[PDB]
Amino acid sequence: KGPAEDTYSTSWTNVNYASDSLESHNLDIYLPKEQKTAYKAIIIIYGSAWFANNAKAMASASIGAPLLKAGFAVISINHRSSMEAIWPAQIQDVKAAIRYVRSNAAKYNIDPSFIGITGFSSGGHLSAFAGVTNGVKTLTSGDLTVDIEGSLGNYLSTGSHVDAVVDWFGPVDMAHMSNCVAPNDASTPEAVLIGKKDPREEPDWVKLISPINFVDKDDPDILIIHGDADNVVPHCQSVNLKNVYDNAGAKATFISVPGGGHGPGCFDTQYFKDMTDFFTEQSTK
Template identity: 40%
Template sequence: MLAGLGMLASVSVAQPPGGVPPGGPMAKANTASIQRKWLDVAYADKSTAQKLDIYLPDTGKGPFPVIVPIHGGAFKMGDKADGQLTPMLAGLKRGYAVVSVNYRLSGEAVFPAQIQDVKAAIRFIRAHASTYQLNPNRIAAWGGSAGGHLAAMAGTTSDITDFDDASLGNAGQSSRVQAVVDWFGPIRFDQMDAQFKASGKGTADHDAANSPESQLLGKPVQQAPDLVKRASPATYISQSDPPMFIEHGTDDRLVPTQQSVDFAAALEKILGHQNVTITLLEGANHGGPQFNTPENLATVFSFLDACLK
């Protein structure tokens, strides 16, 4: 049963919240008033990208349940401290620690480097939980767009050792998460263009050699069926997966809404409807204000409370 809802303050950012602007990175989230924080903590040493920021509530001794924000940006841009972080920071007022993660972008390394980095960051959180007052048994991954894809991957691959790169450190720790919030993440790269053509919405260019998905894989999507399958969270669905909360706008012009609809249906077959929540926000595009209303965020945090508290 979901926990009761409390009062939640509205959030705002300089760029459209919850989504990724097509023209470049977002303005930074406002973290100046957060008293307890550790910035640019290295969780691995293969790349300067492998860093995370830790934010704790201003009061309380913990250990705090952990929200792990994973930024979007077409797998090739974005940052752990940009405006995409703002919705997750609202968790500080609800007693959550927030540990925001950077990962190697596609211009530096192709798949599976990105999910390997996310899982290495989760292992780091567990290994150093006592140092930072974190609860190692209560961790949720939350991301939008490319970050939604990676959050979903973290949720469905907890038992897939292929994505746990021991050379990134803390190999003895689990990379399992206890909940996932997937905001409009792409799930099956090879189906995106066909879905856009069927819906009449969006731009059908994900099969192109220079598309974000092709750049992530290092090959054009339609020429890499094995890689596409390996990079899909839907490939790994199992009964051990955590509860998942999925949201997508009905007017998304970058990632087809059908991606989330199909993913939720596949999850429900294995996990049961009680462990899968999907909400389609009418008229919402690829992120935007509808995701960040106090009412919508209260729903997200109610889900997290039920999973982590």
């Protein structure tokens, strides 16, 4: 459970970041084995089609070790299930976790001058969504307004911005999920996220769950990694995100994994190195 014991010198597990009693608002913190005065931080988020509220250990086991070996503190967070709270609960959870880490950095030997964020599938969606809403309190489409920043926890005065994003095959363009050209029907995970409505009938909801719509020239840099044989979230999603970053004047690096699946082929030394090199380069810029 979690990252290999020899990858970290210090661990805090099941730290609640929302000042409540919900496991969906817990996180785990790991500091690298290589001891140092303070550590730049990476927040990681599991994928689960937004359904899981307790899988932070899976994320740590999946991509925690390379980050620790690269010298970063790793914070793996839970978020609430789409089945217990609809959008924007999940991004409000992420924002609250970010505020908790930034505010409490000193207590955990964390250097708050760099906080990156990364996740796979729905965790990549949440990571990208944080990276397109630095400094953004609310978003509106038509008559619908969602509170992105939220009011969860006891660190509301702390900033919730992230400095860099790594998006592992995240669903980010739900207007173009079905056959890469249309919204999915009410049977699908994004339908649950928006309250079990039919995405094909809810253009405002679909816009407000899709971070591709809010990319701006001033966004933090992003690294996008997607397998060209992903049979769960289509490659077109990351192609589209890169095109939007390119056309918005923002900075995106897109790495396509040949033969890569929804994880398989992607979680290997080469692309872990791409992620840790990216975060390391960003940590200095």
